[PDB]
């Protein structure tokens, strides 16, 4: 029952003037917030996105972020001027921040920073630090960021106190969405797979939640070891799509079935015969 809470920030700085910052917030694999660059306020994407915070607590938290976004934008611009001409636009900065909730009031918080797609900085303990592999020039920005006691105190409180509390409330308020069960629907299809006289069968599974699932090709009761699971692909309705392929001989398709096991089916496995 372990859920990870992820606040994901993407910031593009094209040149000296132009920049945009956009954020999305995930609890497990469900989106709880969106904060577009064009919006002054953070948007709830679920009815329970405020968690168990009062309207006054939320306003105060949002205000802190509103100040952050403006301040972050100016800070990066000033850091670029400080390192010039070492580093120059365009620049992408990503933040991954939040907490992982464990049973019984246990949690770890994190705040990871990526520069041009590479993880270089985190907040750790009471300060900013570079991580192994990071270029040496970041030592001056780190020195400058660590000079700001007020940001340090605030971030410590956000990571240590605010994140775990907020998320605990999210889990209560959003229980019924997080524990939803949505049934997979399967279907079969076939293609030529760049070979002499081989066909590739495809078992399509779509509409299931949550993500954990089992899909295998079977001749009777014999699991076909050639079965290749693809990646989990999202649907727009916050369900998952998956396909499992089996490479076979034309004419030998007869006998094969696709078995699908999922928590939502309650023992009634889906079996599609070719």
């Amino acid at each position, epitope marked *: 029952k372990n859920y990870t809470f992820r606040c994901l920030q993407m910031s593009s700085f094209a040149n000296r003037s132009w920049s945009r910052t956009d954020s999305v917030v995930w609890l497990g694999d469900l989106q709880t917030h969106r904060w577009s660059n064009d919006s002054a306020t953070i948007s709830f994407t679920k009815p329970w996105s405020q968690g168990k915070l009062s309207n006054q607590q939320w306003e105060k938290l949002q205000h802190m972020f509103q*100040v952050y976004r403006v*301040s972050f934008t*100016r*800070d990066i611009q*000033e*850091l670029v*001027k*400080m390192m*010039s001409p070492k580093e120059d636009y365009p620049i992408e900065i990503q933040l991954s921040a939040g907490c992982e909730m464990y049973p019984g009031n246990a949690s770890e918080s994190f705040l990871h920073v990526a520069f041009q797609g590479k993880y270089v900085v985190r907040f750790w303990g009471t300060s900013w630090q570079t991580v192994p592999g990071a270029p040496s020039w970041l030592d*001056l920005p780190i*020195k*400058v*960021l660590n*000079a*700001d*006691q*007020g*940001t340090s105190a605030t971030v410590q409180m956000l990571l240590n106190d605010t994140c775990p509390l907020f998320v605990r409330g999210l889990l209560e308020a959003g229980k019924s969405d997080l524990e939803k069960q949505e049934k997979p629907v399967a279907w079969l299809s076939s293609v030529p797979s760049s070979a002499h006289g081989h066909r590739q069968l495809v078992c399509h599974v779509s509409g299931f939640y949550p993500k954990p699932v089992w899909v295998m090709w079977m001749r009777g009761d014999q699991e076909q070891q050639g079965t290749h699971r693809g990646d989990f692909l999202p649907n727009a309705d916050e369900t998952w799509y998956l396909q499992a392929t089996l490479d076979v001989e034309a004419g030998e398709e007869a006998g094969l079935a696709c078995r699908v096991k999922h928590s939502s089916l309650g023992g009634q496995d889906i079996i599609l015969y070719w």
Partner: T-cell receptor, first 111, second 113 residues
Framework: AAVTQSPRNKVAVTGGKVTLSCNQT?????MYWYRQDTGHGLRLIHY???????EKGDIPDGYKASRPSQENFSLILELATPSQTSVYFC??????????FGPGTRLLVLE | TQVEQSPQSLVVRQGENCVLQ??????????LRWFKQDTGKGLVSLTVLVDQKDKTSNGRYSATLDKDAKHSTLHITATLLDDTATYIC?????????????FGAGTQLIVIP
């Protein structure tokens, strides 16, 4: 952390070249030029994060900055105007928020 | 302007107290400093306030800061002739060199000896 400015006082003609200089032996990366005029707070003209760096402040027009070394930060009025009659203040600092101000330079530009 | 001081000027008699006011719209407000500037001279720091609800003292000078109201006062107790000067309010918007300073235009105090 001591900061010095020279000259301390300067009379100049319109169209003349004026160089206001600031020296600082604290090994501060960061230096800042302001002007003070009656009815206004100090306003930032140019600043510098190190040797070779200059940045536009709030009112940079009519001024060129120059940071040839860690120690020296210069404000250059290439074509001085009477509107640049003012008191000019230089400051330095490290990564901390404190700016340490020089004693000021009085500039009068006559017609 | 983002920093306003009141009164613009005032005359008091030696031994009397006075209050100087600073109001700002600067965001964020990391810290606020009060400067003393004698006529034709430089900027002597009197105090720096950093807390949400802060109080400082330095001899006859004491100060308060209320960040919610965005308001600071400087109190001078038992004024002397040498308190004759301009008093300038400054707000720094960062706890580091990434900060911009926002200067008030100052209050002129004259103490009659």
């Amino acid at each position: 952390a001591a900061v010095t400015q020279s000259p301390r006082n300067k009379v100049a003609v319109t169209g003349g070249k004026v160089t206001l200089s600031c020296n600082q032996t604290n090994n501060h990366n960061n230096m800042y030029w302001y002007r003070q005029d009656t009815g206004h707070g100090l306003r930032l003209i140019h600043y510098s994060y190190g040797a070779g760096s200059t940045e536009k402040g709030d009112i940079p027009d009519g001024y060129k900055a120059s940071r040839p070394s860690q120690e020296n930060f210069s404000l250059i009025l290439e074509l001085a105007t009477p509107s640049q009659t003012s008191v000019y203040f230089c400051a330095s600092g490290d990564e901390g928020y404190t700016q340490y101000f020089g004693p000021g330079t009085r500039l009068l530009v006559l017609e | 302007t983002q920093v306003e001081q009141s009164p613009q000027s005032l005359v008091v008699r030696q031994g009397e107290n006075c209050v100087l006011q600073c109001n700002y719209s600067v965001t964020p407000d990391n810290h606020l400093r009060w400067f003393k500037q004698d006529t034709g001279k430089g900027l002597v720091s009197l105090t720096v306030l950093v807390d949400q609800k802060d109080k400082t003292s330095n001899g006859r000078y004491s100060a308060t800061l209320d960040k919610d109201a965005k308001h600071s006062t400087l109190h001078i107790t038992a004024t002397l002739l040498d308190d004759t000067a301009t008093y300038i309010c400054v707000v720094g918007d960062r706890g580091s060199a990434l900060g911009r300073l926002h200067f008030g235009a100052g209050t002129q105090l004259i103490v009659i000896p």
